[PDB]
């Protein structure tokens, strides 16, 4: 249809298991596959996370209520370092790198923040909404989309999630939106 | 050369092949012409086959 | 002589401009072709030496009007 028949999911149990798997160009020259910072997606969706940031011994009584469920501690920088089955996410900035707490040797979790005045700021919403989607193998954009609770109301992503069309490589044709899972399969157009 | 061999027996039963062709006229023709030397060759097939 | 009886097209002279702009006098012949035409109004084939443009003229005006021009200037066909 002109946009999408957002009525394209009439059996699993809760068909929210949908994804933003669009198409981009090719690498004939020099371009890359990246995502900004926690792409929220203009839609409340309904996602409560357990966002893991690396603050300190003060950010445990207000740097944990803002679309999350905890924050790594000061004793647990390497005192959570004794297992592979034991242990979004984060890494504060400014002049602070975090290879001493995420480095060598297979998981992605970059976006948390960087504040020199607050742990939960007066106006800072947008983190715990939607995931990332960097480079993969034959393209990019993998993640999540709408749900079994909307209609054409999760097609708020349709005009500001497919509209994330940043400069295409060179010798390509980036443009094709698709989603779905747990019933059939498909997508309309761009 | 040919064997019908109908129903009961999966044994080849072609011992006929050792009754003519094979290394018979086929080892014969396989190589060096000969021409007159078979004469000599067969003059032993009888210088022997006398006894 | 290479002339189209419909249009009068005939060979014209000009140049062959090389890559270095050297001009050598040449010609342009027309795309002539003798062609048999069924005149219904004459129960007869009239064959004209015509250029391709010639034909297209005949396909539009119609062999009757066209012969009618040849006739009207003693271009006998």
């Amino acid at each position: 249809k002109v946009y999408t028949i957002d009525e394209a999911a009439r059996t699993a149990k809760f068909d929210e298991t949908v994804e933003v798997h669009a198409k981009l160009g090719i690498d004939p020259r020099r371009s890359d596959q990246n995502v900004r910072g926690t792409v929220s997606l203009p839609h409340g969706l309904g996602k409560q996370v357990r966002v893991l940031a690396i603050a300190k011994g003060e950010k445990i009584k207000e740097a944990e209520e803002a679309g999350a469920d905890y924050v790594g501690g000061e004793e647990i920088i390497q005192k959570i370092l004794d297992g592979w089955m034991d242990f979004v996410m984060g890494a504060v900035g400014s002049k602070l790198g975090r290879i001493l707490g995420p480095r060598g040797l297979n998981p992605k979790a970059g976006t948390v923040g960087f504040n020199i005045g607050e742990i939960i700021r007066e106006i800072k919403a947008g983190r715990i909404e939607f995931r990332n989607d960097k480079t993969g193998a034959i393209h990019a954009p993998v993640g999540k989309a709408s749900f079994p609770p909307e209609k054409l109301a999760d097609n708020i992503r349709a005009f500001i999630r497919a509209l994330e069309a940043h400069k295409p490589e060179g010798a390509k044709g980036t443009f094709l939106r698709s989603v779905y899972v747990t019933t059939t399969m498909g997508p309309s157009v761009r | 050369i040919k064997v019908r061999e109908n129903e009961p027996f999966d044994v080849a039963l072609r011992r006929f092949k050792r009754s003519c062709e094979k290394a018979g006229v086929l080892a014969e023709v396989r190589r060096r012409e000969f021409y007159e030397k078979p004469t000599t060759e067969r003059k032993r097939a009888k210088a022997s086959a006398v006894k | 002589s290479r002339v189209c009886q419909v249009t009068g097209k005939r060979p014209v002279t000009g140049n062959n401009r090389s890559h270095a702009l050297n001009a050598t006098k040449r010609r342009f012949l027309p795309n002539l072709h003798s062609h048999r035409f069924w005149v219904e109004s004459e129960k007869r084939f009239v064959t004209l030496r015509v250029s391709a443009k010639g034909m297209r003229v005949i396909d539009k005006k119609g062999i009757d009007t066209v012969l009618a021009e040849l006739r009207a200037r003693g271009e006998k066909y």
Binding site: - | - | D59, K60, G62
Partner: protein, 149 residues
């Protein structure tokens, strides 16, 4: 070119359409063997006069080769003076130029071969019936009554 056709013409034509054909085909085959013609506009309206006439007009004239039978059921009975032998069985008998000539000869004017008395056509007295023909699809029934006078 465009060219408008004459006869039916195979995988393209119709009988009087405005198809579009490669000029090689138009000259050299079609128009010469007059199966079509240049769509010289002058012509395409030569054909518009030919799009009103014979069709719109002479099919409500076969609505008269049809409403002849609106006067086939509004009388629905002619009698023939044909008697009876030894028990009300026709001493006469009536066919097509009897049921078309004893149809014409009143206010019911039919063409003599427009009266289908399937045979009975005919061999007894009293009421019978017949199939009256004016059009290919629209005929009409009556009732015939051979009167023994």
């Amino acid at each position: 070119m465009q060219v408008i056709l004459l006869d039916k013409v195979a995988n393209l034509g119709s009988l009087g359409d405005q198809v579009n054909v490669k000029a090689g085909y138009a000259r050299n085959f079609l128009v010469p063997q007059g199966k079509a013609v240049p769509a010289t506009k002058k012509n395409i309206e030569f054909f518009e006069a030919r799009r009103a006439e014979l069709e719109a007009k002479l099919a409500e004239v076969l609505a008269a080769a049809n409403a002849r039978a609106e006067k086939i059921n509004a009388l629905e009975t002619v009698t023939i003076a044909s008697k009876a032998g030894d028990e009300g069985k026709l001493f006469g008998s009536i066919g097509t130029r009897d049921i078309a000539d004893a149809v014409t000869a009143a206010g019911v004017e039919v063409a003599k071969s427009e009266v289908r008395l399937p045979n009975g056509v005919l061999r007894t007295t009293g009421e019978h019936e017949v199939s009256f023909q004016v059009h290919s699809e629209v005929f009409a029934k009556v009732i015939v009554n051979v009167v023994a006078e």
